[PDB]
Design a protein around this ligand. Structure first.
Ligand SMILES: [Mg+2]
Ligand SMILES: [Mg+2]
Ligand code: NA
Ligand code: NA
Ligand code: NA
Length: 326
DNA sequence: GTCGG
DNA sequence: GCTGATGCGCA
DNA sequence: CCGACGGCGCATCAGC
């Protein structure tokens, strides 16, 4: 793609700030810059040309100058060489290990996949399962496999109760040719902003997905959000499909549209849409959009009959799901 | 690290 | 047991 | 100049 070198550089810097420095705002600064540069329709010739874009300030522009002159970045070269930095970065690639826990493990001499396997007693459940499937989770899911996963989930959900609606969101709903994992929005008429008329609505779906051996492990689970692991069935004599991350989110049926906006993403898109709402005096979460009062606090939910209605409030032209990718 | 006020 | 804080995950 | 910077579910731990 057009400015891949620059955006790769900014992503790598973002990850270093998040994982090693634990400087979450620098992380967000680099992500924002990376995003805006990724959509820019020309090959960037200078750092001062980048500087024009919002979110690209002095420091990133200098770095871009150095990247375009020398084809690399010295700041980043020395981070790749730092033993403690690279190790902390690696460990964070395990699901369940964040920046804090990664720094802890490196300080105790635990720096590699082998060190982790040799020390499974030190790992909570989530981290155990993230290590187990370390390799499978690094792989992307071809859309063709997502279509098989969709068919299994919708049909098994339809068998628990025909009133559930499942919708597959994330990168899939944005039309990507492959996904990092599977994101499933769930609704049932008995769960609304007014009442939970029926208990265990998510449980029964998880349970049924376990019964037929689609869901294989659980990372975390509660009344409205399931995070775990699934796998497609394979044919006689065939190599098994990799295990895949699956997230299931139960959202009140009267708040579907805010839910599907949230869960369709992208994450950076969600951050910018929500930021823009605040400039306009609103707050958007996955349940509602509420006007911000004259003091600061949020009023009562405004009426929403569609995704578009949320865009209209904040005076943004509608973006189709496929146009909300980085 | 960036930016609006 | 509770609550509040924090880590880590999701888009 | 600076303080603001999306929003929240579940797991875990500290303090009661
Ligand atoms: Mg993701
Ligand atoms: Mg996803
Ligand atoms: Na700029
Ligand atoms: Na991680
Ligand atoms: Na996901």
């Amino acid at each position: 793609t057009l400015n891949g070198g620059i955006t790769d550089m900014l992503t790598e810097l973002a990850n270093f700030e998040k994982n090693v420095s634990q400087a979450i705002h620098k992380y967000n600064a680099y992500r924002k810059a990376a995003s805006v540069i990724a959509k820019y329709p020309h090959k960037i010739k200078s750092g001062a040309e980048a500087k024009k874009l919002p979110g690209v300030g002095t420091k990133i522009a200098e770095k871009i100058d150095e990247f375009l002159a020398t084809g690399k970045l010295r700041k980043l070269e020395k981070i790749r060489q730092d033993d403690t930095s690279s190790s902390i970065n690696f460990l964070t690639r395990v699901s369940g290990i964040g920046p804090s826990a990664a720094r802890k493990f490196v300080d105790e001499g635990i720096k590699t996949l082998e060190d982790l396997r040799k020390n499974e007693d030190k790992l909570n459940h989530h981290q155990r399962i993230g290590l187990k499937y370390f390799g499978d989770f690094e792989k992307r899911i071809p859309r063709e496999e997502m279509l098989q996963m969709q068919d299994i989930v919708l049909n098994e959900v339809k068998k628990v109760d025909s009133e559930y609606i499942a919708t597959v969101c994330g990168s899939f709903r944005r039309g990507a040719e492959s996904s990092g994992d599977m994101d499933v929005l769930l609704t049932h008429p008995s769960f609304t902003s007014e009442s939970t008329k029926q208990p265990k609505l998510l449980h029964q779906v998880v349970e049924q997905l376990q019964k037929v051996h689609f869901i294989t492990d659980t990372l975390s689970k509660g009344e409205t959000k399931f995070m775990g692991v699934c796998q497609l069935p394979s044919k006689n004599d065939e190599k098994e499909y990799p295990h895949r991350r699956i997230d299931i989110r139960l959202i009140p049926k009267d708040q579907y549209y805010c839910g599907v906006l949230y869960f369709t993403g992208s994450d950076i898109f969600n951050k910018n849409m929500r930021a823009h709402a605040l400039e306009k005096g609103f707050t958007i979460n996955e349940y509602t959009i509420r006007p911000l009062g004259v003091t600061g606090v949020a009023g009562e939910p405004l009426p929403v009959d569609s995704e578009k209605d949320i865009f209209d409030y904040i005076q943004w032209k509608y973006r189709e799901p496929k146009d909300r990718s980085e």
